[PDB]
Design a binder for this molecule. Structure first.
Ligand SMILES: CC(=O)N[C@@H]1[C@@H](O)[C@H](O)[C@@H](CO)O[C@H]1O
Lengths: 207, 229
């Protein structure tokens, strides 16, 4: 079950069922926007490059659970953590266990960088129109986006992504407003309002 | 040093065969085992099977004998075939160099040891979607630029399925590039934007082209984007 720890404390993740025989448990780290990487093998051996502050458990005594332990937790430790358990008394396991997310509390807030583009001459020439609102490098990841035709709120025609965590632990998102060229030109301007952590940024474009 | 580039059709019709290929450089395919893992939308990782030059090869029984892993020494490639594609076969597929170890917990002669596997080098994986729906290439549009910097980009509109790649100036421009995760439209089609933050002073002098590739539809497009009137 997911966990959140403050920097410089330690996290423990427990994966799989209790052992029966001897084991050789591997641990995998899957950072956001990255391929998974091996961080522990043969219970507690470390590929070169993995800091000592990552540790797996012994397979003695039996009947215990594979537990990954990270001390001196830091922002970069935010990832999903799986295990691959091999047990001398159990048939080989093909699905990875775990996937527990580690949230590192107390990272600094980052305000969204918001960029609003009007529809292009080419798109308008293809008798279509799309406002493009880009929202990047913000933390925490919760955001809400509202569109305005002049001063009237617009919900119809809007497609807004779910925020996705980047490699640098910040989030990105984007929102689209589909117009007809005639609608785009009818209101005097359009606005993209992004609200994040009690602040609302407004970007505006006009024909 | 070692790099794994897995490639596939990026669309497969139900009850048809999925064929994926993993290109290897920096390493000989003969020196180790090779695995495929598939992550489904959301979380989870499923080890699909592993292959070796000596032919020590096994497969997850959950895949109901539908998969084949092979090696081509001349092309230094690993192959994955997935017969009878179903919706539950979608997701991102990883190629990964797999190494073996030996857990010896007792007396060897009494067989008191087993072989385990770990996967130390993973590729970035390739997206696979199962659907009777037809591929649609994206339409690409320029997003012209207006603190001492300017943002310009490309709109990649109405494509299916994922994924598309965006490079700038043929790869030469990566500093300050943000390619945004696609939006899934209620139409079932995808869009995405690629934006680059540039020094304002360069708007006239330097040229900016976005290179969009949507392989499933064989769509390759270059869009030149410059400031407008
Ligand atoms: C072996 C391999 O594929 N390496 C690439 C790496 O070159 C690239 O910079 C990175 C982007 O996150 O994606 C990895 O998958």
């Amino acid at each position: 079950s997911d966990i959140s720890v403050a920097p410089g404390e330690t996290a423990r993740i427990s994966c799989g069922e209790k052992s029966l025989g001897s084991r050789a448990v591997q641990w995998y780290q899957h950072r956001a926007g990255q391929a998974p990487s091996l961080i522990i093998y043969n219970n507690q051996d470390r590929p070169s490059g993995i800091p000592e502050r990552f540790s797996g458990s012994p397979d003695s005594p039996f009947g215990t659970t594979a537990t990954l332990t990270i001390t001196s937790v830091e922002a970069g430790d935010e990832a999903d953590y799986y295990c691959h358990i091999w047990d001398s008394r159990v048939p080989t396991k093909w699905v990875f266990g775990g996937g527990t997310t580690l949230t590192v509390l107390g990272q600094p807030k980052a305000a969204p960088s918001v960029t609003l583009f009007p529809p292009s001459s080419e798109e308008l020439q293809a008798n279509k129109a799309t406002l493009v609102c880009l929202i990047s490098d913000f933390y925490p990841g919760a955001v809400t986006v509202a569109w305005k035709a002049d001063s009237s709120p617009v919900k119809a025609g809007v497609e807004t992504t779910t925020p996705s965590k980047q490699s640098n632990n910040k989030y990105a998102a984007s929102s689209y407003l589909s117009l007809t060229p005639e609608q785009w030109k009818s209101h005097r301007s359009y606005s993209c309002q992004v609200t994040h952590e009690g602040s609302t940024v407004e970007k505006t474009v006009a024909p | 040093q070692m790099q794994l580039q897995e490639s596939g059709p990026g669309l497969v019709k139900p009850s048809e065969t999925l064929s994926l290929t993993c290109s290897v450089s920096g390493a000989s395919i003969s020196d180790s085992y090779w695995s495929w893992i598939r992550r489904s939308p959301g979380k989870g990782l499923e080890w699909i099977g592993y292959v070796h030059k000596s032919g020590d090869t096994n497969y997850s029984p959950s895949l109901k004998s539908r998969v084949n892993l092979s090696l081509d020494t001349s092309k230094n490639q690993v192959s994955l075939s997935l017969v009878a594609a179903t919706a539950a076969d979608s997701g991102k597929y990883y190629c990964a160099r797999t190494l073996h170890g030996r857990r010896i917990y007792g007396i060897v002669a009494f067989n008191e040891w087993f072989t385990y596997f770990y996967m130390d080098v993973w590729g970035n994986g390739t997206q696979v979607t199962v659907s009777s729906a037809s591929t649609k290439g994206p339409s690409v549009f320029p997003l012209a630029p207006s603190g001492g910097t300017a943002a310009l980009g490309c709109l990649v509109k109405d494509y299916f399925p994922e994924p598309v790649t965006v490079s700038w100036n043929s790869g030469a421009l990566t500093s300050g590039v943000h390619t945004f995760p696609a939006v899934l439209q209620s139409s079932g089609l995808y869009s995405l934007s690629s934006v680059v933050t540039v020094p304002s002073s360069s708007l006239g002098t330097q040229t900016y082209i976005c290179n969009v590739n949507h392989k499933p539809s064989n769509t390759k497009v270059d869009k030149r984007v410059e400031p407008k009137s």
